[PDB]
Amino acid sequence: GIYENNAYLRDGKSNLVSKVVELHGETYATTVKMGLSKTPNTATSAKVKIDAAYLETYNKAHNTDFALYPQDLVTFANEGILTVNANTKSAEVEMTIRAGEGLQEDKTYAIPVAISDQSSDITIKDEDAKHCIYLVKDMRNAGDAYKGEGVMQGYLFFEVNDVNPLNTLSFQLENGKLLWDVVVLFAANINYDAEAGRPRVQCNPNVQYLLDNNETLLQPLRRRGVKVLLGLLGNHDITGLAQLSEQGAKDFAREVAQYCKAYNLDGVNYDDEYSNSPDLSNPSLTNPSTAAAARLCYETKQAMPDKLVTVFDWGQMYGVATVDGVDAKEWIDIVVANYGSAAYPIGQMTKKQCSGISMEFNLGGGGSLSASKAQSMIDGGYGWFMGFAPSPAKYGSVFSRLQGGGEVLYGSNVAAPTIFYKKNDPTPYKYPDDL
């Protein structure tokens, strides 16, 4: 034990082994950090390099298809030599990712990085400790939702039974930026398929209409930089998001990832409400537990590592910080809390993954995104503000609750709306004249 100095690699800014990078400009800078379980010795040393062979391994493990990011666009300071810091049991090297021309739009590329030429005192337990990975997306042309580096971001649920998610586009700052970085199609369901003997994704006709018509009703949001997530919600049977066995969660996560791939979406929100007691004799199910919920989140992220796995902190959906030795910061990207409270991190997550406010736009609770509230949330280190169930019919109240906060968060207040959309209709109508 005393001589085992185990090394692993991670992104130095995020501390994640698998890090999604959005390129909003020409250059993106970070560090690659090698963590050590013991204090280094005098001669301790290592380098990093891009390891293209590992991408084959990674894609097989995740059932993914990521192409390799062009290596010439990736530069390590010092030909990749890690600067060892004895006092912090770590070593790091700067990495710059330059944006390139000729890449395919809306495609995720990978930069697999390996420890190389490590000194004899370092142990690397397996190929997964030996590597970290960056999953790179070029967002340079899809900047309208990008309001700056490190600003607070918006997370919006649409009740798609009633409201068209193109209404995302009704919300702009006076400088033209789109307010809502992430939107959720609330919601597809988990339900029992008696014939298959297991849970399945079940979409009501309103959810299905959006998916079938995603090119006209969802993809326009994504073209302007908004992440569109599929909401998943329990639905009054023996199945639920916090009561799947390991195998049940693996199978369900596979289906969720299939949806997100087929319809070109950006991830999922899980909300554990409305399920009934499970049939414990069914191998796909288990006792309801936050542990089962965590298992599902972990398996979902494994199936779609470049997409967002997010949770509503309600029911038994959130609270277990590790699955199979992997900490929650790797598999919960965003957590939003109930109206009137701020979310909190678990494991090695930070408040940057958490909502500082949740506003129920239909029912009224949760407060307002005022100048004062904006500053309170910034002071608290929160990453997100959440809204639920906006509707054009209630834009007066909705937008009233958004006054003042934009100038603090972004240097530009939210503008009064001039456009709205009707359910299942791509037509931009004039607000308020066409209501």
Tab-separated table of C-alpha atoms in Angstrom:
chain	number	residue	atom	x	y	z
A	1	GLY	CA	0.000	0.000	0.000
A	2	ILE	CA	2.683	2.509	1.019
A	3	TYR	CA	4.514	2.111	-2.340
A	4	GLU	CA	1.379	2.033	-4.503
A	5	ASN	CA	1.137	5.521	-5.986
A	6	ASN	CA	-1.900	5.194	-8.263
A	7	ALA	CA	-2.330	7.736	-11.044
A	8	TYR	CA	-5.357	8.760	-13.029
A	9	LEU	CA	-6.124	11.485	-15.522
A	10	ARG	CA	-8.848	14.134	-15.513
A	11	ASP	CA	-9.675	17.558	-16.875
A	12	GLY	CA	-8.173	20.136	-14.542
A	13	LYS	CA	-10.898	22.787	-14.829
A	14	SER	CA	-13.870	20.446	-14.239
A	15	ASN	CA	-12.133	17.570	-12.462
A	16	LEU	CA	-13.999	15.162	-14.748
A	17	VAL	CA	-12.591	12.078	-16.447
A	18	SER	CA	-15.040	12.636	-19.312
A	19	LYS	CA	-15.569	16.314	-20.192
A	20	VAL	CA	-17.836	17.791	-22.810
A	21	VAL	CA	-16.297	20.936	-24.351
A	22	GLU	CA	-18.355	23.447	-26.270
A	23	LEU	CA	-16.243	25.613	-28.559
A	24	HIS	CA	-17.772	29.105	-28.555
A	25	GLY	CA	-14.707	30.832	-29.934
A	26	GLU	CA	-11.581	30.022	-31.886
A	27	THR	CA	-9.614	28.697	-28.943
A	28	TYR	CA	-10.464	26.800	-25.740
A	29	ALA	CA	-7.927	26.404	-22.947
A	30	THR	CA	-7.783	24.021	-20.024
A	31	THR	CA	-5.339	21.760	-18.190
A	32	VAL	CA	-4.968	17.994	-18.034
A	33	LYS	CA	-4.315	16.829	-14.512
A	34	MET	CA	-2.742	13.628	-13.280
A	35	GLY	CA	-3.858	12.785	-9.756
A	36	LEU	CA	-1.624	10.726	-7.505
A	37	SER	CA	-2.709	8.691	-4.431
A	38	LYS	CA	0.649	9.363	-2.731
A	39	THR	CA	3.082	12.255	-2.426
A	40	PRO	CA	5.476	12.227	-5.429
A	41	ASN	CA	9.171	11.332	-5.118
A	42	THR	CA	12.087	13.431	-6.380
A	43	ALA	CA	12.229	11.712	-9.753
A	44	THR	CA	8.448	11.464	-10.398
A	45	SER	CA	7.509	12.450	-13.965
A	46	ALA	CA	4.977	11.813	-16.723
A	47	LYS	CA	3.707	13.178	-20.003
A	48	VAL	CA	0.378	13.184	-21.745
A	49	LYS	CA	-0.420	12.466	-25.365
A	50	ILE	CA	-3.398	11.999	-27.587
A	51	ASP	CA	-4.103	8.239	-27.804
A	52	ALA	CA	-6.198	7.552	-30.856
A	53	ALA	CA	-6.308	3.778	-30.305
A	54	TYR	CA	-8.190	4.333	-27.039
A	55	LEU	CA	-11.092	5.917	-28.917
A	56	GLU	CA	-11.911	2.503	-30.408
A	57	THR	CA	-12.004	1.059	-26.885
A	58	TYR	CA	-14.080	3.952	-25.556
A	59	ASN	CA	-16.625	3.820	-28.393
A	60	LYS	CA	-17.055	0.046	-27.908
A	61	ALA	CA	-17.521	0.458	-24.136
A	62	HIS	CA	-20.178	3.188	-24.572
A	63	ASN	CA	-21.745	1.893	-27.816
A	64	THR	CA	-20.930	5.233	-29.347
A	65	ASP	CA	-19.448	6.399	-32.668
A	66	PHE	CA	-17.403	9.536	-31.935
A	67	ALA	CA	-14.894	10.603	-34.532
A	68	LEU	CA	-11.413	11.712	-33.511
A	69	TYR	CA	-10.916	15.454	-33.214
A	70	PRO	CA	-8.116	16.567	-35.578
A	71	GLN	CA	-4.905	16.132	-33.593
A	72	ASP	CA	-3.151	19.133	-35.173
A	73	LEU	CA	-5.733	21.414	-33.524
A	74	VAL	CA	-4.767	20.212	-30.029
A	75	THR	CA	-1.622	21.538	-28.381
A	76	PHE	CA	-0.052	20.628	-25.090
A	77	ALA	CA	2.334	23.074	-23.500
A	78	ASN	CA	5.838	21.542	-23.286
A	79	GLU	CA	5.284	18.733	-25.746
A	80	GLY	CA	2.972	17.281	-23.093
A	81	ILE	CA	5.341	17.144	-20.104
A	82	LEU	CA	3.378	17.346	-16.841
A	83	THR	CA	4.626	19.808	-14.217
A	84	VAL	CA	4.685	17.822	-10.975
A	85	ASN	CA	3.519	19.623	-7.814
A	86	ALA	CA	4.704	17.591	-4.786
A	87	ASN	CA	2.561	19.429	-2.223
A	88	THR	CA	-0.782	18.796	-4.038
A	89	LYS	CA	-0.156	15.195	-5.162
A	90	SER	CA	-0.831	16.160	-8.753
A	91	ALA	CA	0.766	17.188	-12.017
A	92	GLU	CA	-0.715	19.198	-14.865
A	93	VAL	CA	-0.126	20.555	-18.378
A	94	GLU	CA	-2.006	23.174	-20.333
A	95	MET	CA	-4.014	22.021	-23.317
A	96	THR	CA	-5.369	24.297	-26.029
A	97	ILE	CA	-8.094	23.158	-28.396
A	98	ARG	CA	-8.336	25.262	-31.565
A	99	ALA	CA	-11.502	25.227	-33.656
A	100	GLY	CA	-11.114	23.899	-37.161
A	101	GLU	CA	-12.764	24.249	-40.540
A	102	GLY	CA	-14.312	21.310	-42.413
A	103	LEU	CA	-15.678	19.394	-39.401
A	104	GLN	CA	-19.285	18.145	-39.707
A	105	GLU	CA	-21.915	20.338	-38.053
A	106	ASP	CA	-23.676	19.053	-34.917
A	107	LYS	CA	-21.176	16.208	-34.450
A	108	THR	CA	-19.241	15.337	-31.270
A	109	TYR	CA	-15.526	14.652	-31.694
A	110	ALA	CA	-13.210	13.060	-29.172
A	111	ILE	CA	-9.812	13.856	-27.734
A	112	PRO	CA	-8.622	10.765	-25.833
A	113	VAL	CA	-5.647	11.704	-23.667
A	114	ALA	CA	-3.256	9.166	-22.095
A	115	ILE	CA	-0.594	9.221	-19.495
A	116	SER	CA	2.679	8.390	-21.242
A	117	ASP	CA	6.313	7.837	-20.191
A	118	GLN	CA	5.456	7.821	-16.495
A	119	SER	CA	8.226	7.244	-13.992
A	120	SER	CA	8.742	3.861	-12.332
A	121	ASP	CA	7.231	4.961	-8.996
A	122	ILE	CA	3.776	5.513	-10.603
A	123	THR	CA	1.163	2.707	-10.866
A	124	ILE	CA	-1.737	2.949	-13.376
A	125	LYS	CA	-4.429	0.400	-12.461
A	126	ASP	CA	-6.164	0.083	-15.857
A	127	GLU	CA	-6.712	1.741	-19.250
A	128	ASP	CA	-9.559	3.793	-17.830
A	129	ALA	CA	-7.290	5.386	-15.136
A	130	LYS	CA	-4.660	5.903	-17.839
A	131	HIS	CA	-6.966	8.114	-19.894
A	132	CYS	CA	-9.293	11.047	-19.803
A	133	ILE	CA	-11.464	12.186	-22.672
A	134	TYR	CA	-12.789	15.404	-24.094
A	135	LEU	CA	-16.007	15.288	-26.135
A	136	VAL	CA	-15.836	18.398	-28.331
A	137	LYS	CA	-18.722	20.199	-30.013
A	138	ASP	CA	-18.228	23.222	-32.318
A	139	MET	CA	-20.836	25.787	-31.205
A	140	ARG	CA	-19.366	28.810	-33.029
A	141	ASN	CA	-22.381	29.229	-35.326
A	142	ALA	CA	-24.928	28.302	-32.632
A	143	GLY	CA	-24.138	31.137	-30.259
A	144	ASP	CA	-27.496	32.812	-29.646
A	145	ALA	CA	-28.047	30.984	-26.360
A	146	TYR	CA	-24.427	31.568	-25.265
A	147	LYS	CA	-24.399	34.600	-23.025
A	148	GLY	CA	-20.752	34.417	-22.007
A	149	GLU	CA	-18.169	32.379	-20.249
A	150	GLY	CA	-19.326	31.266	-16.806
A	151	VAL	CA	-22.602	33.179	-16.690
A	152	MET	CA	-25.653	31.738	-15.015
A	153	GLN	CA	-27.763	29.671	-17.386
A	154	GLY	CA	-31.461	29.029	-17.811
A	155	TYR	CA	-33.297	25.696	-17.600
A	156	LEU	CA	-36.940	25.692	-18.812
A	157	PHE	CA	-39.595	22.987	-18.787
A	158	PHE	CA	-42.448	23.111	-21.319
A	159	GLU	CA	-45.660	21.228	-20.598
A	160	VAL	CA	-45.778	19.928	-24.174
A	161	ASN	CA	-49.306	18.639	-23.718
A	162	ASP	CA	-50.315	22.300	-24.067
A	163	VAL	CA	-47.411	24.553	-25.126
A	164	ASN	CA	-45.169	24.564	-28.172
A	165	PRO	CA	-41.449	24.576	-27.215
A	166	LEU	CA	-40.699	27.010	-30.090
A	167	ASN	CA	-41.871	29.567	-27.506
A	168	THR	CA	-38.306	29.317	-26.263
A	169	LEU	CA	-37.673	31.862	-29.012
A	170	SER	CA	-40.038	34.363	-27.375
A	171	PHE	CA	-37.404	34.952	-24.652
A	172	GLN	CA	-34.527	37.178	-25.695
A	173	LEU	CA	-32.438	39.776	-23.978
A	174	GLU	CA	-32.418	43.314	-25.397
A	175	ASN	CA	-29.110	42.350	-27.018
A	176	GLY	CA	-30.754	39.439	-28.861
A	177	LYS	CA	-29.367	36.513	-26.860
A	178	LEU	CA	-31.731	33.718	-25.985
A	179	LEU	CA	-32.444	33.458	-22.254
A	180	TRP	CA	-33.009	29.692	-21.939
A	181	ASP	CA	-29.879	27.601	-22.468
A	182	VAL	CA	-31.651	24.276	-21.802
A	183	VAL	CA	-35.277	23.329	-22.402
A	184	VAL	CA	-37.117	20.174	-21.440
A	185	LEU	CA	-39.969	18.488	-23.330
A	186	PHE	CA	-42.079	17.551	-20.279
A	187	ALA	CA	-42.678	14.653	-20.556
A	188	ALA	CA	-42.328	11.202	-22.026
A	189	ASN	CA	-43.183	8.430	-19.565
A	190	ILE	CA	-41.799	5.244	-18.201
A	191	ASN	CA	-44.484	2.547	-18.424
A	192	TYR	CA	-44.756	-1.217	-18.290
A	193	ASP	CA	-44.762	-3.199	-21.577
A	194	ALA	CA	-46.580	-6.379	-20.531
A	195	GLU	CA	-45.644	-8.215	-23.726
A	196	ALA	CA	-41.922	-7.459	-23.245
A	197	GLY	CA	-42.141	-7.897	-19.440
A	198	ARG	CA	-40.186	-4.753	-18.806
A	199	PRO	CA	-40.396	-0.957	-18.766
A	200	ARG	CA	-40.350	1.105	-21.975
A	201	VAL	CA	-40.391	4.717	-22.972
A	202	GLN	CA	-44.011	5.664	-23.681
A	203	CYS	CA	-44.811	8.938	-25.415
A	204	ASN	CA	-48.236	10.493	-25.396
A	205	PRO	CA	-49.394	11.851	-28.770
A	206	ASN	CA	-48.283	15.376	-27.950
A	207	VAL	CA	-44.720	14.292	-27.155
A	208	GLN	CA	-44.804	12.009	-30.219
A	209	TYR	CA	-45.936	14.856	-32.493
A	210	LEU	CA	-42.904	16.932	-31.475
A	211	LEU	CA	-40.553	14.025	-32.032
A	212	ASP	CA	-42.082	13.130	-35.412
A	213	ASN	CA	-41.901	16.825	-36.380
A	214	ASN	CA	-38.534	17.536	-34.670
A	215	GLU	CA	-37.075	19.152	-37.826
A	216	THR	CA	-39.648	21.960	-37.690
A	217	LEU	CA	-40.541	22.188	-33.974
A	218	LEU	CA	-37.305	21.251	-32.092
A	219	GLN	CA	-34.235	21.527	-34.349
A	220	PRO	CA	-34.646	25.328	-34.823
A	221	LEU	CA	-33.914	25.697	-31.110
A	222	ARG	CA	-30.779	23.590	-31.374
A	223	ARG	CA	-29.530	25.556	-34.397
A	224	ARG	CA	-29.459	28.626	-32.132
A	225	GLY	CA	-27.622	26.896	-29.343
A	226	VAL	CA	-30.439	25.718	-27.063
A	227	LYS	CA	-30.070	22.213	-25.628
A	228	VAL	CA	-33.332	20.289	-26.007
A	229	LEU	CA	-33.880	17.498	-23.477
A	230	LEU	CA	-36.523	14.793	-23.355
A	231	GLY	CA	-38.281	14.773	-19.975
A	232	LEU	CA	-39.035	11.381	-18.454
A	233	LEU	CA	-41.712	10.985	-15.775
A	234	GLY	CA	-43.445	8.137	-13.949
A	235	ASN	CA	-46.944	7.287	-15.023
A	236	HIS	CA	-49.102	5.210	-12.671
A	237	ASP	CA	-47.847	1.671	-13.010
A	238	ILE	CA	-45.308	-0.715	-11.491
A	239	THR	CA	-42.413	0.997	-13.322
A	240	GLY	CA	-40.551	4.065	-12.180
A	241	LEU	CA	-37.336	5.965	-12.467
A	242	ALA	CA	-36.216	5.163	-8.938
A	243	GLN	CA	-37.226	1.485	-8.934
A	244	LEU	CA	-35.282	-0.193	-11.744
A	245	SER	CA	-32.823	-2.995	-11.021
A	246	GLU	CA	-29.333	-2.807	-12.439
A	247	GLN	CA	-30.454	-4.711	-15.534
A	248	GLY	CA	-33.689	-2.777	-15.793
A	249	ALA	CA	-31.762	0.482	-15.661
A	250	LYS	CA	-29.261	-0.680	-18.312
A	251	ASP	CA	-32.078	-1.600	-20.698
A	252	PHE	CA	-34.069	1.562	-20.040
A	253	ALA	CA	-30.971	3.789	-20.388
A	254	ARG	CA	-30.321	2.113	-23.769
A	255	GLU	CA	-33.816	3.110	-24.954
A	256	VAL	CA	-33.466	6.664	-23.683
A	257	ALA	CA	-30.162	7.019	-25.560
A	258	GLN	CA	-31.862	5.578	-28.705
A	259	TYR	CA	-34.509	8.307	-28.496
A	260	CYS	CA	-31.941	11.024	-28.049
A	261	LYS	CA	-30.002	9.723	-31.031
A	262	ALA	CA	-32.950	9.096	-33.334
A	263	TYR	CA	-34.472	12.543	-32.763
A	264	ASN	CA	-31.160	14.404	-32.346
A	265	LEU	CA	-31.739	15.677	-28.833
A	266	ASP	CA	-29.314	16.791	-26.156
A	267	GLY	CA	-30.152	14.588	-23.181
A	268	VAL	CA	-32.760	13.861	-20.515
A	269	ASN	CA	-34.456	15.114	-17.361
A	270	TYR	CA	-35.600	12.514	-14.872
A	271	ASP	CA	-38.514	13.299	-12.528
A	272	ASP	CA	-39.626	10.563	-10.104
A	273	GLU	CA	-43.308	11.240	-9.658
A	274	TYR	CA	-46.506	9.260	-10.302
A	275	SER	CA	-45.164	5.729	-10.181
A	276	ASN	CA	-46.904	3.053	-8.146
A	277	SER	CA	-45.339	0.218	-6.103
A	278	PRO	CA	-43.199	-2.160	-8.103
A	279	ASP	CA	-43.684	-5.873	-8.679
A	280	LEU	CA	-40.544	-7.043	-6.904
A	281	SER	CA	-40.738	-10.425	-8.678
A	282	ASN	CA	-39.999	-8.684	-11.969
A	283	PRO	CA	-36.227	-8.784	-12.705
A	284	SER	CA	-36.335	-5.274	-14.240
A	285	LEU	CA	-37.586	-3.756	-10.980
A	286	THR	CA	-36.404	-3.330	-7.392
A	287	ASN	CA	-37.353	-1.693	-4.095
A	288	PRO	CA	-37.785	2.063	-4.745
A	289	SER	CA	-34.625	3.826	-3.652
A	290	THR	CA	-32.420	6.751	-4.397
A	291	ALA	CA	-29.787	4.074	-5.053
A	292	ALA	CA	-31.858	2.773	-7.984
A	293	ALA	CA	-32.366	6.303	-9.275
A	294	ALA	CA	-28.592	6.845	-9.153
A	295	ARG	CA	-28.071	3.577	-11.012
A	296	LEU	CA	-30.339	4.789	-13.793
A	297	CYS	CA	-28.523	8.142	-14.030
A	298	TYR	CA	-25.158	6.380	-14.177
A	299	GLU	CA	-26.285	3.922	-16.864
A	300	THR	CA	-27.870	6.749	-18.882
A	301	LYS	CA	-24.676	8.766	-18.857
A	302	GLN	CA	-22.737	5.630	-19.892
A	303	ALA	CA	-25.042	5.269	-22.885
A	304	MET	CA	-24.863	8.951	-23.874
A	305	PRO	CA	-21.684	10.470	-22.398
A	306	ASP	CA	-21.817	13.529	-24.623
A	307	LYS	CA	-25.377	14.376	-23.598
A	308	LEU	CA	-26.884	15.894	-20.484
A	309	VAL	CA	-28.226	13.721	-17.675
A	310	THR	CA	-30.288	15.936	-15.420
A	311	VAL	CA	-32.649	15.443	-12.510
A	312	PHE	CA	-35.519	17.096	-10.734
A	313	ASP	CA	-34.683	16.713	-7.020
A	314	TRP	CA	-38.006	15.220	-6.016
A	315	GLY	CA	-39.257	11.843	-4.955
A	316	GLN	CA	-36.358	9.429	-4.669
A	317	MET	CA	-34.531	10.722	-7.749
A	318	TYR	CA	-31.478	12.341	-6.149
A	319	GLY	CA	-29.146	11.830	-3.224
A	320	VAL	CA	-26.846	8.808	-3.766
A	321	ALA	CA	-23.388	10.100	-4.754
A	322	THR	CA	-21.615	7.087	-6.223
A	323	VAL	CA	-22.421	4.148	-8.505
A	324	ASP	CA	-19.809	1.432	-9.221
A	325	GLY	CA	-17.047	3.630	-7.853
A	326	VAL	CA	-17.939	6.624	-10.044
A	327	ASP	CA	-18.894	9.903	-8.363
A	328	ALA	CA	-22.076	11.802	-9.211
A	329	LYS	CA	-20.249	14.700	-10.840
A	330	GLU	CA	-19.608	12.333	-13.763
A	331	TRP	CA	-23.275	11.468	-14.263
A	332	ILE	CA	-25.494	14.331	-12.992
A	333	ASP	CA	-24.895	17.383	-15.147
A	334	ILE	CA	-27.680	19.587	-13.735
A	335	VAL	CA	-29.979	19.255	-10.733
A	336	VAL	CA	-33.005	21.493	-10.251
A	337	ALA	CA	-34.987	21.791	-7.026
A	338	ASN	CA	-38.573	22.301	-6.017
A	339	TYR	CA	-40.157	25.794	-6.182
A	340	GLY	CA	-38.851	27.971	-3.366
A	341	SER	CA	-35.559	26.195	-2.797
A	342	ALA	CA	-32.099	26.081	-4.357
A	343	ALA	CA	-30.657	22.690	-5.335
A	344	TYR	CA	-27.570	21.307	-3.665
A	345	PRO	CA	-24.636	19.250	-4.861
A	346	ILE	CA	-23.727	15.761	-3.802
A	347	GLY	CA	-20.480	13.860	-4.147
A	348	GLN	CA	-17.891	16.081	-5.810
A	349	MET	CA	-20.466	18.232	-7.608
A	350	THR	CA	-20.422	21.990	-7.166
A	351	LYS	CA	-23.171	24.600	-6.963
A	352	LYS	CA	-22.440	25.322	-10.628
A	353	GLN	CA	-24.485	22.172	-11.358
A	354	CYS	CA	-27.389	23.455	-9.279
A	355	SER	CA	-30.403	25.723	-9.691
A	356	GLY	CA	-30.535	28.744	-7.389
A	357	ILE	CA	-34.236	29.382	-8.031
A	358	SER	CA	-37.171	27.419	-9.496
A	359	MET	CA	-40.133	29.378	-10.796
A	360	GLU	CA	-43.525	27.805	-11.482
A	361	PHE	CA	-44.762	30.069	-14.256
A	362	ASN	CA	-48.269	28.646	-14.424
A	363	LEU	CA	-49.040	28.244	-10.704
A	364	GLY	CA	-46.956	31.164	-9.455
A	365	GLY	CA	-44.593	29.863	-6.784
A	366	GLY	CA	-40.829	30.152	-6.478
A	367	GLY	CA	-40.205	33.879	-6.656
A	368	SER	CA	-38.753	36.147	-9.310
A	369	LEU	CA	-35.482	36.564	-11.197
A	370	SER	CA	-34.968	40.113	-9.919
A	371	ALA	CA	-31.752	42.087	-9.787
A	372	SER	CA	-31.416	41.274	-6.092
A	373	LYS	CA	-32.129	37.588	-6.552
A	374	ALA	CA	-29.674	37.381	-9.436
A	375	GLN	CA	-26.916	38.802	-7.244
A	376	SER	CA	-27.829	36.486	-4.327
A	377	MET	CA	-27.518	33.502	-6.651
A	378	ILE	CA	-24.196	34.699	-8.036
A	379	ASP	CA	-22.923	35.183	-4.446
A	380	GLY	CA	-24.007	31.594	-3.716
A	381	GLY	CA	-22.158	30.187	-6.765
A	382	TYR	CA	-25.237	28.740	-8.428
A	383	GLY	CA	-25.043	27.799	-12.119
A	384	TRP	CA	-28.716	27.720	-13.099
A	385	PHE	CA	-32.147	29.230	-12.783
A	386	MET	CA	-35.142	27.060	-13.537
A	387	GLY	CA	-38.609	27.782	-14.867
A	388	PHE	CA	-41.587	25.516	-15.349
A	389	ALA	CA	-44.689	25.763	-17.591
A	390	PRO	CA	-44.549	29.076	-19.367
A	391	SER	CA	-47.431	29.778	-21.744
A	392	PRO	CA	-48.124	32.657	-24.152
A	393	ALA	CA	-51.429	33.296	-22.401
A	394	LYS	CA	-49.455	34.104	-19.237
A	395	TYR	CA	-46.573	36.085	-20.760
A	396	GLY	CA	-47.511	39.204	-18.783
A	397	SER	CA	-46.789	37.431	-15.458
A	398	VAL	CA	-43.910	35.370	-16.789
A	399	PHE	CA	-41.998	38.315	-18.160
A	400	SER	CA	-42.806	40.445	-15.125
A	401	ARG	CA	-40.952	37.855	-13.033
A	402	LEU	CA	-37.902	38.188	-15.287
A	403	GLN	CA	-37.364	41.949	-14.993
A	404	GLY	CA	-34.107	43.277	-13.563
A	405	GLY	CA	-32.241	39.985	-13.335
A	406	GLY	CA	-30.895	39.979	-16.902
A	407	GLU	CA	-28.963	43.208	-16.477
A	408	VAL	CA	-27.164	41.667	-13.481
A	409	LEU	CA	-26.550	38.245	-15.064
A	410	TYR	CA	-25.793	39.313	-18.611
A	411	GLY	CA	-25.577	43.085	-18.903
A	412	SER	CA	-28.890	43.069	-20.803
A	413	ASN	CA	-32.422	42.743	-19.442
A	414	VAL	CA	-34.976	40.360	-20.834
A	415	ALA	CA	-36.946	42.045	-23.641
A	416	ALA	CA	-40.684	42.043	-23.840
A	417	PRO	CA	-41.870	39.307	-26.189
A	418	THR	CA	-42.916	40.032	-29.749
A	419	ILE	CA	-43.472	36.461	-31.062
A	420	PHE	CA	-45.321	33.377	-29.803
A	421	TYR	CA	-46.188	29.953	-31.158
A	422	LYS	CA	-49.368	27.898	-30.996
A	423	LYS	CA	-49.396	24.200	-30.169
A	424	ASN	CA	-48.080	21.985	-33.003
A	425	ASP	CA	-47.787	24.979	-35.382
A	426	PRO	CA	-44.366	26.245	-36.671
A	427	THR	CA	-45.809	29.666	-37.529
A	428	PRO	CA	-44.332	32.589	-35.617
A	429	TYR	CA	-47.301	34.712	-34.516
A	430	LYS	CA	-47.148	38.299	-33.280
A	431	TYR	CA	-47.384	38.776	-29.528
A	432	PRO	CA	-49.772	40.069	-28.340
A	433	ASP	CA	-51.758	40.919	-31.509
A	434	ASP	CA	-52.298	37.333	-32.732
A	435	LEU	CA	-53.289	35.772	-29.373
